[PDB]
Design a protein around this ligand. Sequence first.
Ligand SMILES: CCCCCCCC/C=C/CCCCCCCC(=O)OC[C@H](O)CO
Ligand SMILES: CCCCCCCC/C=C\CCCCCCCC(=O)OC[C@H](O)CO
Ligand SMILES: NS(=O)(=O)c1cc2c(cc1Cl)N[C@H]([C@H]1C[C@H]3C=C[C@@H]1C3)NS2(=O)=O
Lengths: 96, 111, 268, 85, 175
Amino acid sequence: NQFEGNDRYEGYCVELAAEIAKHVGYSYRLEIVSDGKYGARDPDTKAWNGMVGELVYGRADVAVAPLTITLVREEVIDFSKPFMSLGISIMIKKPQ
Amino acid sequence: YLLESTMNEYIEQRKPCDTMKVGGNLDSKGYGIATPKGSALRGPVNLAVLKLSEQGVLDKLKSKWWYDKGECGSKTSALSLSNVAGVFYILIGGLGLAMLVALIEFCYKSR
Amino acid sequence: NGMVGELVYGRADVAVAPLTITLVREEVIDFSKPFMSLGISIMIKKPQKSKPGVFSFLDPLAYEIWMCIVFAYIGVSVVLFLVSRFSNEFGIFNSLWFSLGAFMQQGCDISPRSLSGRIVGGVWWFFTLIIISSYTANLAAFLTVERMVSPIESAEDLAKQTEIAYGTLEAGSTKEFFRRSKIAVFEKMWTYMKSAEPSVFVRTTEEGMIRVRKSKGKYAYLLESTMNEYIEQRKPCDTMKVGGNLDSKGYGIATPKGSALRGPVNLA
Amino acid sequence: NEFGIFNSLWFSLGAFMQQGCDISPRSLSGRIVGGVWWFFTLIIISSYTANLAAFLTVERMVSPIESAEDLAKQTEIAYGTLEAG
Amino acid sequence: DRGIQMLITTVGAFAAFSLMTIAVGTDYWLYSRGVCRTEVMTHSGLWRTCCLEGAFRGVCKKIDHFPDTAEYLLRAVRASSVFPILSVTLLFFGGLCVAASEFHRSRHSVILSAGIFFVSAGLSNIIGIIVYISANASYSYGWSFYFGAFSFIIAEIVGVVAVHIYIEKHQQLRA
Ligand SMILES: CCCCCCCC/C=C/CCCCCCCC(=O)OC[C@H](O)CO
Ligand SMILES: CCCCCCCC/C=C\CCCCCCCC(=O)OC[C@H](O)CO
Ligand SMILES: NS(=O)(=O)c1cc2c(cc1Cl)N[C@H]([C@H]1C[C@H]3C=C[C@@H]1C3)NS2(=O)=O
């Protein structure tokens, strides 16, 4: 509440967006996606939702979230080289 | 829960640390900076990411936001003193008791 | 020169080799998304399996337990003497002998007769039973346990010392990485490598592998983790990867800048 | 040198703790008591140190799942994912 | 041999007290890596942690002893350092009795009480060490630690000699 704008947030991707902006030489405002979803094409409507939807339809110019590189998404948006590796993993409650 | 390994690791490093990653990774992939198809930002962003990677910036950011968080920081092995400390407490307790009994048995026999 | 040269000058249309994605190369050729991850890593000649020490019989217990056993032994012996003189006989020398025999599970000529002497004796017997049982459990295992110790076991360790020479493949991504580095450790490493005579660099991975194998643990080869792992698994497997990875990167399928194959290759 | 109560207690304790004693029973009934107590001691102490060795060497707290296949094979644990991910 | 025994006792009592007081005061118990907070190689003691490398070399911060009943008790006992302090106290009273044995000779029990104080001081010391090491669960022990250990050894030697003095006294005056 004491802060306003892009300075309201912190985290890995916040600093990454800052550094990218520095290197590229542009100003930016961090808009949180409205849907709160990462991105998927609804098979019935064929509409992209979430961050991917926001990118495609023109409402946003970049996405600096933990957005996974996938074939379906690469067909509709451009991705840079990966900035972090990962895999699908299982999370279980630790026994006592 | 099936989630991405990065989030899984971050969660497992924070209280209430009752969750844990099991096994390996089901596949291998990565996050990318996205842009609209036919954008003019595509090339510069790619080059920026390469610069950031080669300069250790991404490494430092990862190390900062994952490892340094550490809300909870948690086959011939030597026994440690902590494993047997109880036997030492009993021992010194017993020596104390023996000295006490000896003073009594004295004072009783002195009177 | 090499594959990148061929791509730039138009001699080829694609490169499907283990070509590292780097900034300098990205400015002249178009890379795909990486198809394999790697990092820079250290290969050293596998050290000999160290035989356990002359004093390996101490190994089942931490040093601090041994120290505390010794103080406990003195404590018990002094308190025994004291209580007995307050009550052959338990002078200090015999108290020391009694305690030592109790601990070693031997017994000796004398046993306490007083109540306080018997309390001391009883708790020392109990202590002995717990500690000796714990010590003797796995003893033969500790006496026969070989542990290989790496000379360096880190990048910093390799930078600090000067007895082991370390090199790279030249005209490779790793050499370029070290040359253009700004990190303290890697700048130090490069300053060393540039000046070192004879040249620490090699022409081929096989060359570096042979150099580590024939240098009797005086050469450490800096190569990509994928090749390192592959080699370390092959016979005679007398090499070993030491420490973690110095960085993170990946191999990409290259194409000449402005190629028509760029998009299809990425999607493939 | 005789088996009054305090020396009886001391004899028994030494036998149990594997130390031995000043004194040993000489009568038949004393030796019956001593002999069964020696037997009891040998079983119980041996059981303690046998089983102690086991506790000092067990270190494999094995997870039920340990892999994807083990999650797929069972049906007691439900596993999900994030939507639109 | 009465003179030599009393010399050993008196010098020994002073030695043990000095060593133990230094040890409790000084901060070279443990050489571990850590942070003096304005990780780096530090030297710690019972009370303080202090840096040996960097810009903050010589900055020294108070230990947070408190960052299960058994765990709580261990933390409490470690925090207070009741056992090392009790060892210093008992060594103080032992030395006091040793001094008093020269003046008021009429009561023999004074030198015996010195003996009992020194023996007890050593037992307090052992408990201290065990609590210290147990609570700390790469590292190494420094010279303050070894001073505590040498204090234990000397205290036990002096306890033995004091008790011998009293025995010689009760064996001379009965006959
Ligand atoms: C004349 C004969 C003289 C007799 C001389 C006596 C010495 C013999 C041995 C004493 C063992 C010590 C007793 C150990 C008891 C520990 C109990 C304990 O700690 O219990 C924790 C509990 O399980 C909650 O977790
Ligand atoms: C010289 C003075 C005399 C001293 C004498 C005392 C020594 C006693 C020792 C051991 C008794 C153990 C005997 C236990 C044997 C019982 C089991 C058995 O024999 O068989 C079981 C059954 O027949 C099939 O299931
Ligand atoms: N440490 S990490 O896992 O966050 C991480 C992961 C990666 C990094 C950098 C870091 Cl710091 N860089 C690479 C990038 C550099 C060039 C090689 C692969 C891409 C382009 N992506 S990655 O291999 O996914």
